[PDB]
Copies of this chain bind each other. A is one copy, B any other.
Amino acid sequence: GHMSITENTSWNKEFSAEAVNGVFVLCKSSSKSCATNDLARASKEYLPASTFKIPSAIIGLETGVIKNEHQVFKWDGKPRAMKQWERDLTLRGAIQVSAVPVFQQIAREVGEVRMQKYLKKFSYGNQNISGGIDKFWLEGQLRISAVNQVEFLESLYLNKLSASKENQLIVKEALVTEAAPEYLVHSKTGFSGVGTESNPGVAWWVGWVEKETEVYFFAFNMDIDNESKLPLRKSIPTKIMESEGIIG
């Protein structure tokens, strides 16, 4: 891209408090003005986990696998890994509750050939989908950096991905997580799991904030080996955005 990124070690204060190894990337207006606590980690690539439901939803719409925004994903009554998935869901519903089996079936119907095509068009991380069509974003070799997330979300915000504008808009409405008269957040979490010995998992929070006529893009990730640390994925970025005057 044409990203211009400045390291700002003052942000590390928010991480040391809870002994978190992670990165926050925050861009005002565009990728031409980004800041981070850690330039090295900003460009390091991790498993996307549920953040991948953003490209996946757009690819589902583009291919016709998802017929339109009113598509209902019916639950077959068989056990699913979380109780909050054991129910019929809309597209927004499935994204918001990170309904993995819904997106596993989307991925299967999209198929390897089309999936590869679109991750190339989107410049989505290392674009490596190998090893199983219904789990490459969960435990396979797909990797993306915080910098790449921000660039990808900026394109989405601008309707500049190689997808119809209407498909980008549908997926954006599905990502709205806070709506006030002059404060709108689009965001998505992810969590790969707790990893293995000496190879922690990754937790994500990515999105953008529209406050007045200003827009801020963000991507956070952190190493995680314990599920009780999970809420830090939103609290640390929230604190940093508060200190910048974005939130509150």
Q: Is the interface of A mostly helix, strand, loop or mixed?
A: mixed
B213 A93 Cβ-Cβ under 8 A: yes
Query: Which residues of the other chain, B, contact A76 by a CB distance below 8 angstroms?
Result: none
Copies in the complex: 2
* Residue interface bits A160-179, CB-to-B below 8 A is 1, else 0: 00000110011011001111
- State whether the Cβ of A53 lies closer than 8 Å to any Cβ in chain B: no
Stretch at the interface among A84-92, A144-152, A198-206, A229-237: A84-92
A179 B182 Cβ-Cβ under 8 A: no
Instruction: Please report the C-alpha to C-alpha distance between residue A178 and residue B97 in the assembled complex, in whole angstroms.
Output: 16
Q: Measured between C-beta atoms, what is the minimum distance from A104 to chain B in Å?
A: 19
Known contacts: A166-B166, A172-B173. The answer to whether A90 contacts B179 by CB under 8 A is no
B213 A181 Cβ-Cβ under 8 A: no
The one of B97, B166, B181 that contacts A182, using a Cβ cutoff of 8 Å: B97
B166 A213 Cβ-Cβ under 8 A: no
* Residue interface bits A30-42, CB-to-B below 8 A is 1, else 0: 0000000000000
Instruction: Please report the C-alpha to C-alpha distance between residue A110 and residue B180 in the assembled complex, in whole angstroms.
Output: 28
A182 B212 Cβ-Cβ under 8 A: no
Chain A interface, number of residues (Cβ within 8 angstroms): 28
* Residue interface bits A97-135, CB-to-B below 8 A is 1, else 0: 100000000000000000000000000000000000000
Query: Which residues of the other chain, B, contact A165 by a CB distance below 8 angstroms?
Result: 166
Query: Which residues of the other chain, B, contact A170 by a CB distance below 8 angstroms?
Result: 169
Instruction: Please report the C-alpha to C-alpha distance between residue A210 and residue B96 in the assembled complex, in whole angstroms.
Output: 13
Instruction: Please report the C-alpha to C-alpha distance between residue A93 and residue B210 in the assembled complex, in whole angstroms.
Output: 10
- State whether the Cβ of A72 lies closer than 8 Å to any Cβ in chain B: yes
Query: Which residues of the other chain, B, contact A65 by a CB distance below 8 angstroms?
Result: none
* Residue interface bits A212-227, CB-to-B below 8 A is 1, else 0: 1100000000000000
Name A residues whose Cβ lies closer than 8 Å to a Cβ of B. 70, 72, 87-90, 92-93, 96-97, 158, 165-166, 169-170, 172-173, 176-182, 184, 210, 212-213
Q: What 16 new A-B contacts, CB under 8 Å, besides A87-B212, A173-B173?
A: A72-B213, A88-B212, A89-B212, A89-B213, A90-B210, A92-B210, A93-B181, A96-B182, A97-B181, A166-B169, A169-B169, A169-B173, A172-B173, A176-B179, A177-B179, A179-B179
Closest 4 pairs between A and B when the two form their complex, measured CB to CB: A96-B181, A169-B169, A179-B179, A176-B179
